[PDB]
Amino acid sequence: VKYVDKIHIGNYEIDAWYFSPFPEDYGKQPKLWLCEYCLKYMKYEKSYRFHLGQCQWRQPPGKEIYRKSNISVHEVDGKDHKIYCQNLCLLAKLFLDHKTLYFDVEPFVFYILTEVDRQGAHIVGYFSKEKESPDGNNVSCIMILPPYQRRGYGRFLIAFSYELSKLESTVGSPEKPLSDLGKLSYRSYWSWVLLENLRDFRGTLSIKDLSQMTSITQNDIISTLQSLNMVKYWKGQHVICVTPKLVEEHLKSAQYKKPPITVDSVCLKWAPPK
Ligand SMILES: O=C(NNS(=O)(=O)c1ccccc1F)c1cc(F)cc(-c2ccccn2)c1
Numbered sequence: 001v002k003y004v005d006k007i008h009i010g011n012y013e014i015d016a017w018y019f020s021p022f023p024e025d026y027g028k029q030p031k032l033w034l035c036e037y038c039l040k041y042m043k044y045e046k047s048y049r050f051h052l053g054q055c056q057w058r059q060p061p062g063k064e065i066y067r068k069s070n071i072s073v074h075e076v077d078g079k080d081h082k083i084y085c086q087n088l089c090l091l092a093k094l095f096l097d098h099k100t101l102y103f104d105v106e107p108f109v110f111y112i113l114t115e116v117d118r119q120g121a122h123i124v125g126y127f128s129k130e131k132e133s134p135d136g137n138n139v140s141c142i143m144i145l146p147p148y149q150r151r152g153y154g155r156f157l158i159a160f161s162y163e164l165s166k167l168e169s170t171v172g173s174p175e176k177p178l179s180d181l182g183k184l185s186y187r188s189y190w191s192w193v194l195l196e197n198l199r200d201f202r203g204t205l206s207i208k209d210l211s212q213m214t215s216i217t218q219n220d221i222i223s224t225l226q227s228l229n230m231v232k233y234w235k236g237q238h239v240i241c242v243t244p245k246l247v248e249e250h251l252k253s254a255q256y257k258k259p260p261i262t263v264d265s266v267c268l269k270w271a272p273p274k
């Protein structure tokens, strides 16, 4: 009843954070070996090395809905690529506590973030999304592989998820409960997006205005402004209350000085030209 506790994927060895229900015989091995392109999981270095020489995948399946320079996103329908998405969900569960869904991947669309070189498109992370979210969740689960965490890739995927919400003419919010790292990442993302808009629009924006500009829900906006102490309350209404000294002294922290990977909406292929 040994669990999977270590994986080898690409040129990375990664320790597990949580139990993932790989078949029992796969957990018995010291490490489990993942093809970084098709996400097939294997029990031995020799089966892994043989697969690397045979596997012709060099990128995620599905449609490449984003490509700028060597940063790429693939949209993968869980129904059209069931095995690939199950493998993805088992991999993700090694690093996600709350994720309970691994094999019934059909209700979901998966957005795979990759980093490309001459060899292929190397998986960095993903977020899943319900094709029909009754709550209004524009992200179900989001996971960045540990060697890529805290390096801007999670920020890119969060920004990407709100770009999709904009093109759908809707607001959206990540599904709860958030992971520990997702909660910090969303709070940091919401802060920068809201603080940048208030700096560049003179604050002449309501909470509803910000919600339409960013596809962030009014609730997530309000709780973020509350954390920034930038909202007044008047007769049941939340009112933005902000000055330049407030905006700048919150913006000029070290948090908002790493240059992001940036979602260039020009390179997002949402609708075909015909
Ligand atoms: O890698 C991430 N965060 N660091 S970040 O990209 O540089 C960044 C900077 C500023 C603002 C936001 C932001 F994401 C990241 C983001 C998430 F949503 C989830 C996970 C995650 C959680 C659980 C397991 C694996 N992965 C990791």
Ligand SMILES: [Mg+2]
Pocket (backbone or CB within 6 Å): 013, 014, 015, 146
């Ligand atoms: Mg590790």
Ligand SMILES: [Zn+2]
Pocket (backbone or CB within 6 Å): 035, 036, 037, 038, 039, 040, 051, 055, 056, 057
């Ligand atoms: Zn493969």
